[PDB]
Amino acid sequence: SARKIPKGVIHVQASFNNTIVTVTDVRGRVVSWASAGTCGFRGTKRGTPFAAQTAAGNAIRTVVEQGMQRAEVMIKGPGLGRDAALRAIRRSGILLSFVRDVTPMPHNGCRPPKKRRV
Amino acid sequence: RGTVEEKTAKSDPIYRNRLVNMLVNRILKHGKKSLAYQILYRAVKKIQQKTETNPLSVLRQAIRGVTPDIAVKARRVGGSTHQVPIEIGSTQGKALAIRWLLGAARKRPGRNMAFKLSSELVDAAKGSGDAVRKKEETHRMAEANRAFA
Amino acid sequence: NEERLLNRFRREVMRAGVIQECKRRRYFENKQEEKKRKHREAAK
Amino acid sequence: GPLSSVKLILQGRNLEVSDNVRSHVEDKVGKSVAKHSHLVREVDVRLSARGGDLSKGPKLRRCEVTLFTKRHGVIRAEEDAESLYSSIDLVSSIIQRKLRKIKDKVSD
RNA sequence: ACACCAACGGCGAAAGCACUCUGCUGGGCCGACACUGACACUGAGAGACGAAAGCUAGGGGAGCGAAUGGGAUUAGAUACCCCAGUAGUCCUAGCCGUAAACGAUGGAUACUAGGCGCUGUGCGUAUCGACCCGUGCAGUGUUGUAGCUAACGCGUUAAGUAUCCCGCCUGGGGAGUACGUUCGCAAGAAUGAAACUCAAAGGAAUUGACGGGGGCCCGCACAAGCGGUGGAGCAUGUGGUUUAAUUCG
């Protein structure tokens, strides 16, 4: 089990080739995580909006032991996995308070690597 | 090229049905229309002999179980081939339905084409045989790749 | 809730296109004039 | 094309062909399209000669090589040189660029 | 290392210079006559500074990343892709003195349409205070008259008209090489030929063709069907082989 409080943050690591749908409490002990590599298929298929939908659905379908009402989602990063994930959470329709972005916006910190030339 | 002029489709010779006339045109091989006519109406007189319902009912109820709602169109973007499924239309599903039904009906041996089309037709009416399995193996491939669009 | 998306709509305020910008290398004024000339003309 | 390669077909017009000629054909053409890994179907090498002491006009040796490949079309190269050997080497170079055009265009 | 601010923006002689604050200090621009009275311009040789990579000495080392190593693609891959990753990147003190160090345009003065701008100050209007209009200059930009130009274009910031001062050029290779000398810890930099050989090497523009450059539109061109060939047998034609000839095209 857990603390049994039905409010908790959801983080969506939407990568450029993957998604991770994790869900955790206010302190930060994770109650479940499920990614595109978690839900079966793996390779070039993972990181597509069907993987965001299935990974989000298989992520938050297992919080029915909690039955969280007051949801709040804190996504991160670029990729094709955001909008399908928000349509998945709104499909489950639980009390999504506010979604938000927490993406790392650097202030010219490190040099990003070589351009691809492909 | 732009389009095809709209359509002209007549009904069945003796039952006045636009589906069964489509089926008698699809069983036609090189002009022998009286023989394809003969095969279809011997199949109907066979289907009155097997069960005791309307042949429109067992035929339409058969081809509802052959018609797919979605299929694989192996399309391309940037040189990259996605197996993305695109939702097929209705009368397209009719033509594919009696297509797989008829070609699969040209495999089950033993007797004349009336028994062959009858047997694969009732197998479509019961979810057995090969046409509805062909529906499944063309249906569980587009289901297998929904991670594209 | 309804199926409206204001996070994408609000997202183009400060676009995630500052992250597709920062994957590839720190390069000087040739591609900063290409990207920032096309970007100084996209907003005018 | 000694073994495993595309099927060789010679044509000899105005030219009695020898051992050194078609040997130079299969060794220069075949052994320069020996680093291929191509299942090209058919190579038609049509090797005609003309002029000089044979008839009116300058001394010419003219080869056309045609490849009916599976791999994106058919190709042919005609070159006309002072000797047979310079013709077949020159068409050998041209068909090297055309096959690297085909293999290199298969990318991504 | 310093996001948004960032602007076809400001400053520096150029290279360069952007998180903020402080200290020292250069340079620019404008006004009043406040002063001196031609003190001006250029500059051989000289001297300074001079992106990046490089080297000596010592720190430091997160990211990135030559070389390297492994995986992949590939006929092959010492390469593009990917995963690790050393010198280097940063700083102190030096050396090196080259870059497409480009505005591909040495500097200075005088004169020769305009339009649209931006930056800094000055005057008048307007209010009495921020505006706002015209302007006096200096600088920066964009279209453009005259004129020049082989053309493209440049055009008050000329590639215009003139004057001055310095550098550099006289066909292309050979060759920024050889030899010598100076500088440099080395890497190399600078100065810089000839033998021989070629009748071209180049610039701007045009017309075509072509592009694994766009844009648009047809075609049984692909896709959707339907039916075949390639498998078997035969008819026939060609190539090869054979023969005295297997006529020739």
PDB file of all heavy atoms in Angstrom, chain E residues 132-143:
ATOM      1  P     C E 132       7.795  60.936 -29.114  1.00  0.00           P
ATOM      2  OP1   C E 132       7.020  59.683 -29.275  1.00  0.00           O
ATOM      3  OP2   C E 132       9.195  61.000 -29.604  1.00  0.00           O
ATOM      4  O5'   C E 132       6.955  62.090 -29.817  1.00  0.00           O
ATOM      5  C5'   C E 132       5.724  61.793 -30.458  1.00  0.00           C
ATOM      6  C4'   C E 132       5.210  62.969 -31.243  1.00  0.00           C
ATOM      7  O4'   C E 132       5.043  64.114 -30.368  1.00  0.00           O
ATOM      8  C3'   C E 132       6.114  63.483 -32.348  1.00  0.00           C
ATOM      9  O3'   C E 132       6.018  62.714 -33.534  1.00  0.00           O
ATOM     10  C2'   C E 132       5.642  64.918 -32.524  1.00  0.00           C
ATOM     11  O2'   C E 132       4.460  64.956 -33.312  1.00  0.00           O
ATOM     12  C1'   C E 132       5.281  65.306 -31.089  1.00  0.00           C
ATOM     13  N1    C E 132       6.323  66.100 -30.389  1.00  0.00           N
ATOM     14  C2    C E 132       6.490  67.473 -30.639  1.00  0.00           C
ATOM     15  O2    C E 132       5.792  68.034 -31.494  1.00  0.00           O
ATOM     16  N3    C E 132       7.428  68.172 -29.956  1.00  0.00           N
ATOM     17  C4    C E 132       8.168  67.544 -29.041  1.00  0.00           C
ATOM     18  N4    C E 132       9.089  68.234 -28.370  1.00  0.00           N
ATOM     19  C5    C E 132       8.022  66.162 -28.761  1.00  0.00           C
ATOM     20  C6    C E 132       7.086  65.495 -29.435  1.00  0.00           C
ATOM     21  P     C E 133       6.935  63.056 -34.807  1.00  0.00           P
ATOM     22  OP1   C E 133       7.052  61.821 -35.615  1.00  0.00           O
ATOM     23  OP2   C E 133       8.168  63.737 -34.342  1.00  0.00           O
ATOM     24  O5'   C E 133       6.068  64.091 -35.653  1.00  0.00           O
ATOM     25  C5'   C E 133       6.552  64.594 -36.884  1.00  0.00           C
ATOM     26  C4'   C E 133       6.478  66.099 -36.944  1.00  0.00           C
ATOM     27  O4'   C E 133       6.424  66.660 -35.613  1.00  0.00           O
ATOM     28  C3'   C E 133       7.670  66.781 -37.588  1.00  0.00           C
ATOM     29  O3'   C E 133       7.570  66.789 -38.996  1.00  0.00           O
ATOM     30  C2'   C E 133       7.647  68.179 -36.983  1.00  0.00           C
ATOM     31  O2'   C E 133       6.783  69.031 -37.717  1.00  0.00           O
ATOM     32  C1'   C E 133       7.027  67.934 -35.604  1.00  0.00           C
ATOM     33  N1    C E 133       7.980  68.012 -34.473  1.00  0.00           N
ATOM     34  C2    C E 133       8.529  69.227 -34.048  1.00  0.00           C
ATOM     35  O2    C E 133       8.257  70.276 -34.647  1.00  0.00           O
ATOM     36  N3    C E 133       9.361  69.229 -32.982  1.00  0.00           N
ATOM     37  C4    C E 133       9.643  68.099 -32.338  1.00  0.00           C
ATOM     38  N4    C E 133      10.471  68.157 -31.296  1.00  0.00           N
ATOM     39  C5    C E 133       9.085  66.856 -32.738  1.00  0.00           C
ATOM     40  C6    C E 133       8.271  66.873 -33.794  1.00  0.00           C
ATOM     41  P     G E 134       8.628  65.982 -39.884  1.00  0.00           P
ATOM     42  OP1   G E 134       7.925  64.857 -40.548  1.00  0.00           O
ATOM     43  OP2   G E 134       9.819  65.720 -39.038  1.00  0.00           O
ATOM     44  O5'   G E 134       9.063  67.035 -40.991  1.00  0.00           O
ATOM     45  C5'   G E 134      10.402  67.487 -41.060  1.00  0.00           C
ATOM     46  C4'   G E 134      10.544  68.890 -40.530  1.00  0.00           C
ATOM     47  O4'   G E 134      10.020  68.956 -39.183  1.00  0.00           O
ATOM     48  C3'   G E 134      11.967  69.407 -40.404  1.00  0.00           C
ATOM     49  O3'   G E 134      12.471  69.920 -41.623  1.00  0.00           O
ATOM     50  C2'   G E 134      11.847  70.466 -39.318  1.00  0.00           C
ATOM     51  O2'   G E 134      11.346  71.680 -39.856  1.00  0.00           O
ATOM     52  C1'   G E 134      10.772  69.866 -38.414  1.00  0.00           C
ATOM     53  N9    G E 134      11.312  69.148 -37.245  1.00  0.00           N
ATOM     54  C8    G E 134      11.129  67.820 -36.972  1.00  0.00           C
ATOM     55  N7    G E 134      11.684  67.436 -35.859  1.00  0.00           N
ATOM     56  C5    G E 134      12.266  68.586 -35.367  1.00  0.00           C
ATOM     57  C6    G E 134      13.000  68.828 -34.193  1.00  0.00           C
ATOM     58  O6    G E 134      13.361  68.091 -33.303  1.00  0.00           O
ATOM     59  N1    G E 134      13.444  70.154 -34.077  1.00  0.00           N
ATOM     60  C2    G E 134      13.143  71.109 -34.975  1.00  0.00           C
ATOM     61  N2    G E 134      13.558  72.377 -34.765  1.00  0.00           N
ATOM     62  N3    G E 134      12.440  70.911 -36.059  1.00  0.00           N
ATOM     63  C4    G E 134      12.041  69.646 -36.201  1.00  0.00           C
ATOM     64  P     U E 135      13.298  68.982 -42.630  1.00  0.00           P
ATOM     65  OP1   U E 135      12.680  69.079 -43.967  1.00  0.00           O
ATOM     66  OP2   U E 135      13.518  67.665 -41.991  1.00  0.00           O
ATOM     67  O5'   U E 135      14.730  69.653 -42.693  1.00  0.00           O
ATOM     68  C5'   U E 135      15.729  69.260 -41.777  1.00  0.00           C
ATOM     69  C4'   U E 135      15.992  70.340 -40.769  1.00  0.00           C
ATOM     70  O4'   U E 135      15.099  70.198 -39.637  1.00  0.00           O
ATOM     71  C3'   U E 135      17.368  70.315 -40.147  1.00  0.00           C
ATOM     72  O3'   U E 135      18.337  70.881 -40.997  1.00  0.00           O
ATOM     73  C2'   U E 135      17.156  71.085 -38.852  1.00  0.00           C
ATOM     74  O2'   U E 135      17.128  72.479 -39.104  1.00  0.00           O
ATOM     75  C1'   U E 135      15.743  70.640 -38.463  1.00  0.00           C
ATOM     76  N1    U E 135      15.749  69.536 -37.476  1.00  0.00           N
ATOM     77  C2    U E 135      15.985  69.847 -36.150  1.00  0.00           C
ATOM     78  O2    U E 135      16.184  70.974 -35.736  1.00  0.00           O
ATOM     79  N3    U E 135      15.977  68.777 -35.300  1.00  0.00           N
ATOM     80  C4    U E 135      15.763  67.456 -35.626  1.00  0.00           C
ATOM     81  O4    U E 135      15.790  66.603 -34.739  1.00  0.00           O
ATOM     82  C5    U E 135      15.525  67.213 -37.011  1.00  0.00           C
ATOM     83  C6    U E 135      15.523  68.238 -37.862  1.00  0.00           C
ATOM     84  P     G E 136      19.721  70.122 -41.260  1.00  0.00           P
ATOM     85  OP1   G E 136      19.685  69.502 -42.603  1.00  0.00           O
ATOM     86  OP2   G E 136      20.026  69.296 -40.070  1.00  0.00           O
ATOM     87  O5'   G E 136      20.760  71.317 -41.283  1.00  0.00           O
ATOM     88  C5'   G E 136      20.584  72.413 -40.400  1.00  0.00           C
ATOM     89  C4'   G E 136      21.678  72.438 -39.376  1.00  0.00           C
ATOM     90  O4'   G E 136      21.140  72.221 -38.053  1.00  0.00           O
ATOM     91  C3'   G E 136      22.705  71.341 -39.527  1.00  0.00           C
ATOM     92  O3'   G E 136      23.636  71.627 -40.541  1.00  0.00           O
ATOM     93  C2'   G E 136      23.311  71.255 -38.138  1.00  0.00           C
ATOM     94  O2'   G E 136      24.261  72.290 -37.940  1.00  0.00           O
ATOM     95  C1'   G E 136      22.096  71.552 -37.259  1.00  0.00           C
ATOM     96  N9    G E 136      21.491  70.343 -36.678  1.00  0.00           N
ATOM     97  C8    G E 136      20.273  69.777 -36.952  1.00  0.00           C
ATOM     98  N7    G E 136      20.029  68.720 -36.231  1.00  0.00           N
ATOM     99  C5    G E 136      21.152  68.598 -35.434  1.00  0.00           C
ATOM    100  C6    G E 136      21.485  67.644 -34.453  1.00  0.00           C
ATOM    101  O6    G E 136      20.815  66.683 -34.084  1.00  0.00           O
ATOM    102  N1    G E 136      22.729  67.880 -33.885  1.00  0.00           N
ATOM    103  C2    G E 136      23.560  68.914 -34.218  1.00  0.00           C
ATOM    104  N2    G E 136      24.729  68.995 -33.564  1.00  0.00           N
ATOM    105  N3    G E 136      23.261  69.811 -35.131  1.00  0.00           N
ATOM    106  C4    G E 136      22.059  69.588 -35.695  1.00  0.00           C
ATOM    107  P     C E 137      24.227  70.430 -41.410  1.00  0.00           P
ATOM    108  OP1   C E 137      24.437  70.905 -42.798  1.00  0.00           O
ATOM    109  OP2   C E 137      23.393  69.238 -41.127  1.00  0.00           O
ATOM    110  O5'   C E 137      25.642  70.177 -40.750  1.00  0.00           O
ATOM    111  C5'   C E 137      26.127  68.862 -40.615  1.00  0.00           C
ATOM    112  C4'   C E 137      26.648  68.619 -39.232  1.00  0.00           C
ATOM    113  O4'   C E 137      25.597  68.842 -38.255  1.00  0.00           O
ATOM    114  C3'   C E 137      27.094  67.204 -38.955  1.00  0.00           C
ATOM    115  O3'   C E 137      28.367  66.912 -39.496  1.00  0.00           O
ATOM    116  C2'   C E 137      27.030  67.146 -37.445  1.00  0.00           C
ATOM    117  O2'   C E 137      28.107  67.873 -36.877  1.00  0.00           O
ATOM    118  C1'   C E 137      25.748  67.939 -37.180  1.00  0.00           C
ATOM    119  N1    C E 137      24.514  67.104 -37.090  1.00  0.00           N
ATOM    120  C2    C E 137      24.298  66.090 -36.128  1.00  0.00           C
ATOM    121  O2    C E 137      25.189  65.799 -35.308  1.00  0.00           O
ATOM    122  N3    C E 137      23.145  65.404 -36.125  1.00  0.00           N
ATOM    123  C4    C E 137      22.195  65.706 -37.012  1.00  0.00           C
ATOM    124  N4    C E 137      21.076  64.997 -36.944  1.00  0.00           N
ATOM    125  C5    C E 137      22.347  66.731 -37.973  1.00  0.00           C
ATOM    126  C6    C E 137      23.502  67.394 -37.962  1.00  0.00           C
ATOM    127  P     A E 138      28.506  65.793 -40.638  1.00  0.00           P
ATOM    128  OP1   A E 138      29.494  66.270 -41.629  1.00  0.00           O
ATOM    129  OP2   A E 138      27.158  65.389 -41.094  1.00  0.00           O
ATOM    130  O5'   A E 138      29.139  64.560 -39.867  1.00  0.00           O
ATOM    131  C5'   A E 138      30.124  64.772 -38.871  1.00  0.00           C
ATOM    132  C4'   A E 138      29.993  63.770 -37.761  1.00  0.00           C
ATOM    133  O4'   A E 138      28.848  64.089 -36.935  1.00  0.00           O
ATOM    134  C3'   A E 138      29.735  62.347 -38.203  1.00  0.00           C
ATOM    135  O3'   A E 138      30.914  61.688 -38.619  1.00  0.00           O
ATOM    136  C2'   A E 138      29.092  61.732 -36.971  1.00  0.00           C
ATOM    137  O2'   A E 138      30.078  61.398 -36.008  1.00  0.00           O
ATOM    138  C1'   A E 138      28.280  62.903 -36.431  1.00  0.00           C
ATOM    139  N9    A E 138      26.865  62.847 -36.825  1.00  0.00           N
ATOM    140  C8    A E 138      26.192  63.688 -37.665  1.00  0.00           C
ATOM    141  N7    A E 138      24.924  63.396 -37.801  1.00  0.00           N
ATOM    142  C5    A E 138      24.757  62.293 -36.990  1.00  0.00           C
ATOM    143  C6    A E 138      23.648  61.498 -36.691  1.00  0.00           C
ATOM    144  N6    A E 138      22.438  61.704 -37.196  1.00  0.00           N
ATOM    145  N1    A E 138      23.807  60.469 -35.836  1.00  0.00           N
ATOM    146  C2    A E 138      25.022  60.265 -35.325  1.00  0.00           C
ATOM    147  N3    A E 138      26.142  60.941 -35.532  1.00  0.00           N
ATOM    148  C4    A E 138      25.939  61.954 -36.378  1.00  0.00           C
ATOM    149  P     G E 139      30.904  60.792 -39.948  1.00  0.00           P
ATOM    150  OP1   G E 139      32.312  60.558 -40.335  1.00  0.00           O
ATOM    151  OP2   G E 139      29.990  61.427 -40.924  1.00  0.00           O
ATOM    152  O5'   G E 139      30.275  59.409 -39.470  1.00  0.00           O
ATOM    153  C5'   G E 139      30.889  58.666 -38.430  1.00  0.00           C
ATOM    154  C4'   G E 139      29.923  57.736 -37.737  1.00  0.00           C
ATOM    155  O4'   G E 139      28.814  58.476 -37.179  1.00  0.00           O
ATOM    156  C3'   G E 139      29.253  56.675 -38.589  1.00  0.00           C
ATOM    157  O3'   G E 139      30.085  55.563 -38.835  1.00  0.00           O
ATOM    158  C2'   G E 139      28.039  56.308 -37.759  1.00  0.00           C
ATOM    159  O2'   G E 139      28.406  55.407 -36.729  1.00  0.00           O
ATOM    160  C1'   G E 139      27.676  57.647 -37.119  1.00  0.00           C
ATOM    161  N9    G E 139      26.532  58.315 -37.770  1.00  0.00           N
ATOM    162  C8    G E 139      26.492  59.464 -38.512  1.00  0.00           C
ATOM    163  N7    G E 139      25.295  59.780 -38.919  1.00  0.00           N
ATOM    164  C5    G E 139      24.495  58.776 -38.412  1.00  0.00           C
ATOM    165  C6    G E 139      23.100  58.563 -38.503  1.00  0.00           C
ATOM    166  O6    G E 139      22.241  59.227 -39.079  1.00  0.00           O
ATOM    167  N1    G E 139      22.712  57.420 -37.833  1.00  0.00           N
ATOM    168  C2    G E 139      23.564  56.599 -37.160  1.00  0.00           C
ATOM    169  N2    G E 139      23.050  55.531 -36.553  1.00  0.00           N
ATOM    170  N3    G E 139      24.852  56.787 -37.059  1.00  0.00           N
ATOM    171  C4    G E 139      25.247  57.881 -37.706  1.00  0.00           C
ATOM    172  P     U E 140      29.889  54.714 -40.176  1.00  0.00           P
ATOM    173  OP1   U E 140      30.989  53.727 -40.270  1.00  0.00           O
ATOM    174  OP2   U E 140      29.653  55.704 -41.252  1.00  0.00           O
ATOM    175  O5'   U E 140      28.536  53.909 -39.948  1.00  0.00           O
ATOM    176  C5'   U E 140      28.484  52.809 -39.054  1.00  0.00           C
ATOM    177  C4'   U E 140      27.082  52.279 -38.906  1.00  0.00           C
ATOM    178  O4'   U E 140      26.213  53.324 -38.394  1.00  0.00           O
ATOM    179  C3'   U E 140      26.398  51.848 -40.190  1.00  0.00           C
ATOM    180  O3'   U E 140      26.792  50.575 -40.653  1.00  0.00           O
ATOM    181  C2'   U E 140      24.932  51.924 -39.814  1.00  0.00           C
ATOM    182  O2'   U E 140      24.573  50.808 -39.023  1.00  0.00           O
ATOM    183  C1'   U E 140      24.917  53.169 -38.929  1.00  0.00           C
ATOM    184  N1    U E 140      24.559  54.387 -39.691  1.00  0.00           N
ATOM    185  C2    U E 140      23.238  54.585 -40.022  1.00  0.00           C
ATOM    186  O2    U E 140      22.338  53.835 -39.717  1.00  0.00           O
ATOM    187  N3    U E 140      22.971  55.717 -40.727  1.00  0.00           N
ATOM    188  C4    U E 140      23.872  56.656 -41.136  1.00  0.00           C
ATOM    189  O4    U E 140      23.469  57.627 -41.765  1.00  0.00           O
ATOM    190  C5    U E 140      25.218  56.394 -40.766  1.00  0.00           C
ATOM    191  C6    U E 140      25.499  55.300 -40.073  1.00  0.00           C
ATOM    192  P     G E 141      26.803  50.286 -42.231  1.00  0.00           P
ATOM    193  OP1   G E 141      27.319  48.914 -42.409  1.00  0.00           O
ATOM    194  OP2   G E 141      27.451  51.422 -42.922  1.00  0.00           O
ATOM    195  O5'   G E 141      25.268  50.266 -42.647  1.00  0.00           O
ATOM    196  C5'   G E 141      24.469  49.154 -42.306  1.00  0.00           C
ATOM    197  C4'   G E 141      23.009  49.344 -42.629  1.00  0.00           C
ATOM    198  O4'   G E 141      22.514  50.629 -42.194  1.00  0.00           O
ATOM    199  C3'   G E 141      22.587  49.293 -44.080  1.00  0.00           C
ATOM    200  O3'   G E 141      22.619  47.985 -44.618  1.00  0.00           O
ATOM    201  C2'   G E 141      21.181  49.879 -44.016  1.00  0.00           C
ATOM    202  O2'   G E 141      20.251  48.894 -43.601  1.00  0.00           O
ATOM    203  C1'   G E 141      21.315  50.906 -42.891  1.00  0.00           C
ATOM    204  N9    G E 141      21.286  52.294 -43.380  1.00  0.00           N
ATOM    205  C8    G E 141      22.306  53.183 -43.541  1.00  0.00           C
ATOM    206  N7    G E 141      21.904  54.338 -43.992  1.00  0.00           N
ATOM    207  C5    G E 141      20.541  54.196 -44.136  1.00  0.00           C
ATOM    208  C6    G E 141      19.564  55.104 -44.595  1.00  0.00           C
ATOM    209  O6    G E 141      19.706  56.271 -44.959  1.00  0.00           O
ATOM    210  N1    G E 141      18.295  54.554 -44.566  1.00  0.00           N
ATOM    211  C2    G E 141      18.015  53.283 -44.165  1.00  0.00           C
ATOM    212  N2    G E 141      16.732  52.917 -44.207  1.00  0.00           N
ATOM    213  N3    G E 141      18.920  52.428 -43.745  1.00  0.00           N
ATOM    214  C4    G E 141      20.150  52.948 -43.757  1.00  0.00           C
ATOM    215  P     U E 142      22.804  47.766 -46.195  1.00  0.00           P
ATOM    216  OP1   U E 142      23.043  46.326 -46.438  1.00  0.00           O
ATOM    217  OP2   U E 142      23.790  48.763 -46.666  1.00  0.00           O
ATOM    218  O5'   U E 142      21.381  48.132 -46.808  1.00  0.00           O
ATOM    219  C5'   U E 142      20.240  47.348 -46.504  1.00  0.00           C
ATOM    220  C4'   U E 142      18.961  48.036 -46.909  1.00  0.00           C
ATOM    221  O4'   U E 142      18.811  49.292 -46.211  1.00  0.00           O
ATOM    222  C3'   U E 142      18.847  48.418 -48.368  1.00  0.00           C
ATOM    223  O3'   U E 142      18.498  47.312 -49.171  1.00  0.00           O
ATOM    224  C2'   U E 142      17.789  49.512 -48.344  1.00  0.00           C
ATOM    225  O2'   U E 142      16.490  48.950 -48.294  1.00  0.00           O
ATOM    226  C1'   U E 142      18.071  50.190 -47.003  1.00  0.00           C
ATOM    227  N1    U E 142      18.836  51.442 -47.154  1.00  0.00           N
ATOM    228  C2    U E 142      18.125  52.578 -47.431  1.00  0.00           C
ATOM    229  O2    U E 142      16.919  52.593 -47.547  1.00  0.00           O
ATOM    230  N3    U E 142      18.865  53.712 -47.563  1.00  0.00           N
ATOM    231  C4    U E 142      20.222  53.814 -47.463  1.00  0.00           C
ATOM    232  O4    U E 142      20.743  54.915 -47.600  1.00  0.00           O
ATOM    233  C5    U E 142      20.891  52.600 -47.163  1.00  0.00           C
ATOM    234  C6    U E 142      20.190  51.481 -47.031  1.00  0.00           C
ATOM    235  P     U E 143      18.806  47.334 -50.739  1.00  0.00           P
ATOM    236  OP1   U E 143      18.938  45.932 -51.191  1.00  0.00           O
ATOM    237  OP2   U E 143      19.920  48.277 -50.983  1.00  0.00           O
ATOM    238  O5'   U E 143      17.477  47.939 -51.365  1.00  0.00           O
ATOM    239  C5'   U E 143      17.405  48.230 -52.748  1.00  0.00           C
ATOM    240  C4'   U E 143      16.414  49.324 -53.029  1.00  0.00           C
ATOM    241  O4'   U E 143      16.332  50.225 -51.898  1.00  0.00           O
ATOM    242  C3'   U E 143      16.769  50.228 -54.190  1.00  0.00           C
ATOM    243  O3'   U E 143      16.430  49.672 -55.442  1.00  0.00           O
ATOM    244  C2'   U E 143      15.999  51.491 -53.870  1.00  0.00           C
ATOM    245  O2'   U E 143      14.633  51.328 -54.209  1.00  0.00           O
ATOM    246  C1'   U E 143      16.105  51.541 -52.350  1.00  0.00           C
ATOM    247  N1    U E 143      17.204  52.404 -51.866  1.00  0.00           N
ATOM    248  C2    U E 143      17.185  53.775 -52.053  1.00  0.00           C
ATOM    249  O2    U E 143      16.330  54.410 -52.637  1.00  0.00           O
ATOM    250  N3    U E 143      18.250  54.443 -51.533  1.00  0.00           N
ATOM    251  C4    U E 143      19.304  53.924 -50.839  1.00  0.00           C
ATOM    252  O4    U E 143      20.183  54.681 -50.443  1.00  0.00           O
ATOM    253  C5    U E 143      19.252  52.516 -50.667  1.00  0.00           C
ATOM    254  C6    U E 143      18.225  51.833 -51.165  1.00  0.00           C
TER     255        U E 143
END
